[PDB]
Structure 1
Amino acid sequence: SMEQVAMELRLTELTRLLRSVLDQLQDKDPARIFAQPVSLKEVPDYLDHIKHPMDFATMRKRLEAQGYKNLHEFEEDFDLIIDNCMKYNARDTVFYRAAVRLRDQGGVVLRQARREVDSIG
């Protein structure tokens, strides 16, 4: 149908918006602490601590599979990256501190992307 295509044009443009957002969030992690999943060879107990791991490459695979239906689902995944880190790592660590910074810097980008998605449907 013609409706299914127009929806697909929107999903595709939402995917195009979220990719820009994702690159902007990732530029706020220049140390690349959050680029890749936490290694289970190196942190073998990780899954006993963290039930839903998340990272920027895993967000990218889902993004390019047009697997984010809306901004909320995308934001949930971003928040996981931060929240997982802040639980697993103590306050006085480079890792915990890198998440606090990513969160604070991300907030601005996510504020404007909420307005852009509402604004352009």
Structure 2
Amino acid sequence: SMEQVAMELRLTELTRLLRSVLDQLQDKDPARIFAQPVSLKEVPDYLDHIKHPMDFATMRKRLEAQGYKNLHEFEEDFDLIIDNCMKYNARDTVFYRAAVRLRDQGGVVLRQARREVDSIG
């Protein structure tokens, strides 16, 4: 139908906007601490601690399959990256500190994304 097509155009455009959001968030991680899944070869107990691992590469795969229906779903995945790290790693570690800085800097990007998503509909 024409409606299914219109709906599909909306999703494609959301995917375009979220791709730009993701790029902007990933720039706030210049050390690439959150770029890839935590390695289960290198951290074999990880899934005993963290039940829903997340990272930027994994978000990107979902995004490119148009697997984010709305901004809420995308933010959920971003918050997992941060929250997983702040639980697994102690406060005095470069990893925890990286997550805090990503959270703080990402807030600004995500604030305007929400306005854009509501605005453009």
CA displacement at 1:46 relative to structure 2: 0.0
2-structure distance, mates of 1:101, 1:30:
11
Consecutive unaligned residues of structure 1, counting only runs of 5 or more, are: none
Q: Give 1:49's aligned residue.
A: 49
Q: Please state how far the C-alpha of 1:6 moved relative to its aligned partner.
A: 0.2
Q: What is the CA distance between 1:13 and its match in structure 2?
A: 0.0
After TM superposition, the score normalised by the length of structure 2 is 1.00
Q: Secondary structure at the match of 1:25?
A: helix
Q: Deviations over 1:22-63 (max 9, x none)?
A: 000000000000000000000000000000000000000000
TM-score normalized with structure 1 length: 1.00
Cα drift, residue 99 of structure 1: 0.1
Cα deviation per residue 1:38-89 (whole Å; 9 max; x = unaligned)? 0000000000000000000000000000000000000000000000000000
Describe the SS at the equivalent of 2:90: coil
Give the share of equivalent positions with the same residue, in percent.
100
Q: How many residues align?
A: 121
Distance between the aligned counterparts of 1:118 and 1:9, measured in 2? Answer: 16
User: What is the CA distance between 1:3 and its match in structure 2?
Assistant: 0.2
CA–CA separation in structure 1 for the residues paired with 2:41 and 2:12? 36
Cα distance in structure 2, aligned partners of 1:15 and 1:52 = 23
Using the alignment, how far apart are the partners of 1:16 and 1:93 within structure 2? Answer: 35
Tell me how far 1:19 sits from its aligned partner. 0.1
SS of 1:38's equivalent in the other structure is: coil
Gaps of 5+ in 2: none
Secondary structure of the structure 2 residue equivalent to 1:30: coil
State the alpha-carbon separation in 2 of the partners of residues 114 and 66 from structure 1. Answer: 18
Tell me the distance in 1 between the aligned counterparts of 2:86 and 2:35. 16
Residue pairs, 1:1-121, within 5 angstroms: 1-121=1-121
